[PDB]
Amino acid sequence: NTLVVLHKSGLLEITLKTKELIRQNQATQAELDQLKEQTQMFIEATKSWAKLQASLT
Amino acid sequence: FSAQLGAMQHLKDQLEQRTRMIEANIHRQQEELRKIQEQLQM
Amino acid sequence: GAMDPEFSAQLGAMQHLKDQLEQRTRMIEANIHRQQEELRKIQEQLQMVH
């Protein structure tokens, strides 16, 4: 009856909330990584460029 | 050259807008985190 | 051994899981702080553009 004890203890609910928060936070890290690369590309461009064209196509 | 400044400023403004969107998502995550931590201090 | 074996093991398993969850929230908390600093850095770089 481990699933029952997990539920009645409150830890089922908390574990589920924590897994969803981890998912969200990993999604946000992927968004940040892409934004980092786009920013760096944009800054590089202002100081060279057609490297923008590849992205903006 | 005014035209170029406005184009790059349009790019800059969209990237800045992205930072603000991501910031709001993290603020919401921080509030969910606080609630989980409170439940873990049963 | 009055205590039922499954009951005793479930007790230790839930305490362990609680500890793991507390640690995972600490990890999330630290990542959020790092991601905030990364957004700060991106904002600082963008303001250098004209």
Helix-strand topology string of chain A: HHH
- Percent of residues in β-strands of chain B: under 5%
Oligomer: heterotrimer
Please estimate the helix content of chain B.
Answer: over 70%
How much helical structure, as a percent, in the residues of chain A?
A: over 70%
Backbone shape of chain A: rod-shaped
Region (Implicated in the circadian rhythmicity) (chain B): 1-42
Protein name (chain B): Circadian locomoter output cycles protein kaput
Subcellular location (chain B): Nucleus; Cytoplasm; Cytoplasm, Cytosol
Coiled coil (chain A): 13-44
Map the helices and strands.
The complex is a heterotrimer, with one copy of chain A (57 residues) and two copies of chain B.
Chain A: H1 2-8, H2 11-45, H3 51-56
Chain B: H1 2-40
Key descriptive features of the protein:
heterotrimer, A: mainly alpha, B: 42 residues, mainly alpha, 1 helix, 93% helix, Circadian locomoter output cycles protein kaput (chain B), CLOCK-interacting pacemaker (chain A), transcription, CLOCK protein, repressor
Account of the 3D structure:
The complex is a heterotrimer, with one copy of chain A (57 residues) and two copies of chain B. With 57 residues, chain A is mainly α. Chain A has one domain (1-57). Chain A has helices at residues 2-8, 11-45, 51-56. By secondary structure, chain B is an all-alpha fold. Chain B has one domain. Chain B is built from one helix and no strands. The longest helix of chain B has 39 residues, at 2-40. Classes of the chains: A mainly alpha (57), B mainly alpha (42). Chains A and C meet through α1 and α2 of A and α1 of C. Chain B: This is Circadian locomoter output cycles protein kaput. Chain B: Residues 1-42 are annotated as: Implicated in the circadian rhythmicity. Chain B: It is found in: Nucleus; Cytoplasm; Cytoplasm, Cytosol.
